[PDB]
Amino acid sequence: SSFKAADLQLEMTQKPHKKPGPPLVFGKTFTDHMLMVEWNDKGWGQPRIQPFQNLTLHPASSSLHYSLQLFEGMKAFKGKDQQVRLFRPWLNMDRMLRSAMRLCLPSFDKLELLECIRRLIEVDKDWVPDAAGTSLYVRPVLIGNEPSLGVSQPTRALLFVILCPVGASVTPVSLLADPAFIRAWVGGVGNYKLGGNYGPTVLVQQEALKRGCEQVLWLYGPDHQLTEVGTMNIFVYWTHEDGVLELVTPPLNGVILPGVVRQSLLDMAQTWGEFRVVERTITMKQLLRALEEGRVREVFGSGTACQVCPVHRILYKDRNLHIPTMENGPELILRFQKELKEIQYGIRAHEWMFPV
Amino acid sequence: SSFKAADLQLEMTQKPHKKPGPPLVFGKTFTDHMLMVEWNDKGWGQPRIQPFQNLTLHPASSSLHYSLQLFEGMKAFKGKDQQVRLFRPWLNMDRMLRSAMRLCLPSFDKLELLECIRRLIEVDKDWVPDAAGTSLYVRPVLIGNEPSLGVSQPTRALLFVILCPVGAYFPGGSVTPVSLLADPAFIRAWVGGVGNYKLGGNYGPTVLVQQEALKRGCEQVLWLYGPDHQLTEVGTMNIFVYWTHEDGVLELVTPPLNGVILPGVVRQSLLDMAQTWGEFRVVERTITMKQLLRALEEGRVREVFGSGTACQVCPVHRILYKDRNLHIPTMENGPELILRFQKELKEIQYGIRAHEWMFPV
Ligand SMILES: *Cc1c(COP(=O)(O)O)cnc(C)c1O
Ligand SMILES: *Cc1c(COP(=O)(O)O)cnc(C)c1O
Ligand SMILES: C[C@H]1CNc2c(cccc2S(N)(=O)=O)C1
Ligand SMILES: C[C@H]1CNc2c(cccc2S(N)(=O)=O)C1
Ligand SMILES: [Cl-]
Ligand SMILES: [Cl-]
Ligand SMILES: [Cl-]
Ligand SMILES: [Cl-]
């Protein structure tokens, strides 16, 4: 029953907002327009681009009671030629549909939404900044909207998309590694980008700050597996226990969100063929031995907001572990950053980019 | 640092809803008014009772993106004397504040919100039905309302309360027993998670699982946890087993509050009543499928049942454990204990017997 971009409805604002002045804080500033699509028992309605406006919801909306909500996060970059491109948007649409199905929310056509998103970004092109290291953040959302307190498959839903000009990497982060905090469980929904996975992390992150750390290192299992850092996937660049240099990141076994940047770093590294690229469980036990034996070169997080984020300290069992990421260049990090920048800003042509 | 009931602003409705005629569907019908209190950097605003209306929310509202939401559920009952009473509402206030603290949502004064809820139900008192087994379901909600995509402690929040006249939760509710799907592949909660808080995030993921129970011929989900398949909860209810234990003692057992169990008000009440009676052992202990399978084949199980505000005591007659279809003899055993719990709750709830558990409206 998918909505169609052909049926799009445009309604331009009466009074555009004054763009930012070359200090942009992430996700606070929004653009003039937004996409909105309604679903009900008659199926999907016509998508519309409309001025950025509030949502009107029935107070029993299942979005607000039973967390029938999921989101996405992706970026559009403006090249020198003032051309704007989305990075691997198809993977975000893929992941959004899976999230949708997990919450019994309505199915939709991935290319239709991608086209609607394209048009929306097209309409707000001038918001997309071109300054170094800047981008447009795109936040699609699908929430349920059943006006009743039954916990059930909804018969109403809203799909909408907002846009944020953003700025920001160079500086590393410190992590709190405390196993009392568990982000996701095998058989759970940690591998889907559902709102309910995030709310509970707010307190945990406050604890990390009180303990002088900047982010949370999410550990899993009795053997303390490194799963993710904050809202980022985790990569370790080391010489492994079998003497072979490798880039490792935990495998998609259910507690890991399959990042787009994660997959892209795996793709890039493999393409180079210069070292082993593997998806494997990483335990604190292995990390310690590797640190004491000097085999660790870099540790970083990956995610759309902070594409490659160096890690230099992990506070584990009340004692600080130094991570020599910044001493080792960080060569791999900077190399990852350089190529992604070349691709994203259109210096190198690449099928990963989708032009707006 | 809290709204005050003394500052309540009343805005009566100018378009009153037609009240239900002579068949209530749970959670679909709403009363004329609602409670509403906003929070921001200046603190709690003034509370208001206003006509039932839509919420206006910024599109980046942290309630919709990062699930900064929690809710409660409790009942008001009208006795034959027309006096309306709330069942142990203080426990709901206690639990709501714990949820709020877990999601870094703003604190409030439990006794002030309770008074505000009293004032709200008082306005809509004629919505409270009085037919047998009817009540008014009270749904408070607290949500974050930050118009920012950062995952962080909100600087804006929204506390509201809506009301539903209700009958039974499902047709033949609390009378006709239910069947459960017990598959270990499904996880509701985990130690170190937030399953022991009444947060919206715990419920959305269960919809698909409930569909799968229907698909396999069952009505509710028996949530198992751990290697040894512990019976945690049934649907949105706590689970109780009344049996003769392996040590030959007749006991009422329910899983303990170790992190994967939502501390139900009805649960606590059933434990309180049973322990007070002093007629049989009453324990909080984990319960495994192996213990249940073994207790069944030795004919030691009397009654298995769920508890929760919407279906206070819900009998269970069947459990599908993987491919093994298990018959639970709850109904052939009276269900003597279920009936006694129901009878005593009713007398307390509809004002037959004055009791410290009832808060008058
Ligand atoms: C969004 C997200 C990521 C990374 O996703 P990208 O698709 O690379 O932006 C990693 N972990 C978690 C928990 C996330 O929510
Ligand atoms: C609300 C709830 C219960 C029971 O709570 P009561 O306070 O007894 O209504 C049990 N389990 C879950 C998962 C719940 O959400
Ligand atoms: C649709 C309602 C039905 N009832 C409950 C809900 C949520 C949490 C607990 C319950 S309970 N404990 O009242 O069964 C949603
Ligand atoms: C404000 C944003 C910051 N970044 C992310 C958020 C949520 C989910 C994933 C991310 S990520 N993976 O892009 O860092 C919140
Ligand atoms: Cl791609
Ligand atoms: Cl996956
Ligand atoms: Cl009490
Ligand atoms: Cl608890």
Q: List, as one string, the DSSP characters of B144-182.
A: E--BS-S-S--S-EEEEEEEEEE--SSTTTTTS-EEEEE
Measured from the Cα of A74, ligand 1's closest atom is 9
Contact A54 B54 (CB under 8 A): no
Nearest to A218 by CA among A196, A238, A201, A243: A201
Whole-angstrom distance, CA of residue B118 vs CA of residue B140:
12
Question: What is the Cα–Cα distance from B230 to B236, expressed in whole angstroms?
Answer: 16
Please judge whether B204 and A139 are an interchain contact, meaning their C-beta atoms are less than 8 angstroms apart: no
Q: Is B176 left (phi over 0), alpha (psi -120 to 50) or beta?
A: beta
**Cβ proximity of B294 and B224 under 8 Å:** no
For ligand 1, what atom is nearest to the CA of residue A303?
8
β-bridge mates for residue B77, sequence order:
B85
From the CA of B74, how far away is ligand 3's center (Å)? 9
| Residues B31, B12: Cα–Cα separation, whole Å | 12
Read out DSSP for B94-122?
HHHHHHHHHTTPPP--HHHHHHHHHHHHH
Top residue of B54, B64, B98 to mutate, by most chain A CBs within 10 Å, is B64
DSSP B205: T
Which experimental approach was used here?
X-ray
Contact A205, A216 (CB under 8 A): yes
Does residue A74's CB lie within 6 angstroms of at least one atom of ligand 4? no
Q: Are A107 and A2 in contact (CB under 8 A)?
A: yes
* Token code pair at residue B345: 């709750």
- The residue among A28, A53, A66, A257 with the most chain B CBs within 10 A of its CB, best to mutate, is A66
- Do the beta carbons of residue B178 and residue B220 sit within 8 Å? yes
Does 3.20.10.10 match the CATH number of domain B172-346?
yes
Orientation of helix B265-277 relative to helix B89-102, angle to 10° = 130
List of chain A residues whose C-beta atoms are within 8 Å of the C-beta of residue B151: 198, 201-202, 205, 231
- B357 Cα to the center of ligand 7, angstroms: 5
Q: In chain B, how long is the greatest CA-to-CA distance?
A: 64
Report the residue of chain B nearest A51, measured CA to CA. Answer: B59
Q: Report which of A134, A215, A137 is spatially closest to residue A174, judged by C-alpha positions.
A: A215
Alpha-carbon distance of A151 to A12, in angstroms, equals 37
Element (H or E) spanning B274, and its range?
Answer: helix B265-277
Domain boundaries B1-171+347-361, corresponding CATH code: 3.30.470.10
In this structure, the residue with its CA closest to atom 15 of ligand 2 is B236
How far apart are alpha carbons B86 and B152 in whole angstroms?
Answer: 35
Q: Are A284 and A315 in contact (CB under 8 A)?
A: no
Of A141, A160, A203, the CB nearest to B104: A203
Q: What six digits make up the tokens of A196?
A: 């309910």
Q: Where are the domains of chain B?
A: 1-171+347-361, 172-346
Radius of gyration in angstroms for the set of CA atoms belonging to chain A, rounded to a whole number? 21
A356 in Cβ contact with A84 (< 8 Å): yes
Which residues in chain B touch residue A104, judged by CB atoms under 8 angstroms apart?
Answer: 207-208, 211
Q: What backbone phi and psi angles, to 5 degrees, belong to A13?
A: -65, 160
- Cα of A300 from ligand 1 centre, angstroms: 13
Q: Do A68 and B28 touch (CB under 8 A)?
A: no
Of the candidates A143, A185, A201, which has its C-beta nearest B190's C-beta? A185
The atom of ligand 4 lying closest to the CA of A305 is 13
Residue B40 phi/psi, 5-degree rounding, is -155, -165
Q: Which residues contact B203 (CB under 8 A, 6 or more apart)?
A: A65, A66, A67, A151, B236
A196 to B199: CB separation less than 8 angstroms, yes or no: yes
- Residue A136 and residue A32: Cα distance in Å, rounded? 13
Rounded to 5°, angle at Cα B101 from B97 and B103: 120
* Concatenated DSSP letters of B210-235: HHHHHHTT-SEEEEEETTTTEEEEET
C-alpha span between A316 and A339 (Å, rounded): 33
Q: A345 a known binding residue? A: no
Question: Quick one: three-class SS letters along A274-301?
Answer: CCEEEECCCEHHHHHHHHHCCCEEEEEE
CA dihedral A162, A166, A170, A173 (to 10 degrees): -50
Separation of alpha carbons B200 and A197, rounded Å? 11
Q: Which two tokens stand for residue B22?
A: 């002579």
A-chain CB neighbours of B199 within 8 Å are 67, 196, 199-200
Query: Chain B residue closest to A138 (CA)?
Result: B149
Shortest CA distance to A217 belongs to which of A291, A287, A316, A328? Answer: A316
Q: Quick check: helix, strand or coil at residue B302? A: strand
| Cross-chain residue pair A55–B58, CB shorter than 8 Å | yes
- CA of A304 vs chain B CAs: smallest distance (Å): 13
Resolution in A: 2.3
Using the structure block, give the residue that is written with the tokens 């209306």. B53
Q: What is the 3-state secondary structure (H, E, C) of A173-202?
A: EEEEECCCCCCCCCCCCCCCCEHHHCCCHH
Residue ID of nearest Cα to ligand 3 atom 1: A150
What single string gives the DSSP state of each residue in B278-293?
A: TSSEEEE---BHHHHH
CA gap B263, B237 in Å, rounded: 10
**Cβ pair B193:A199 closer than 8 A:** no
- Compute the distance between CA of residue B330 and CA of residue B338 in angstroms, rounded to an integer: 9
In the chain, the amino acid numbered A226 is L
Contact B207 A64 (CB under 8 A): no
Q: What does the alpha-carbon distance between residue B111 and residue B105 come to, in Å, rounded to a whole number?
A: 18
Beta carbon of B309 within 6 Å of any ligand 3 atom: yes
Classify domain A1-168+342-356 at the CATH topology level: D-amino Acid Aminotransferase; Chain A, domain 1 (3.30.470)
Beta carbons of B141 and A189 less than 8 Å apart: no
Three-class DSSP category at B295: helix
What spacing in Å lies between the alpha carbon of B308 and ligand 3's midpoint? 7
CB under 6 Å to ligand 1: residues?
A 73, 193, 228, 231-233, 257, 259-262, 302-304
Most B CBs within 10 Å, among A69, A182, A193, to test the B interface: A69
Report the CATH superfamily, name and number, of domain A169-341. D-amino Acid Aminotransferase, subunit A, domain 2 (3.20.10.10)
The dihedrals phi and psi of B341, each to the nearest 5 degrees, come to: -50, -50
Q: How far is the CA of A337 from the centre of ligand 4 (A)?
A: 18
A33 forms beta bridges with: A51
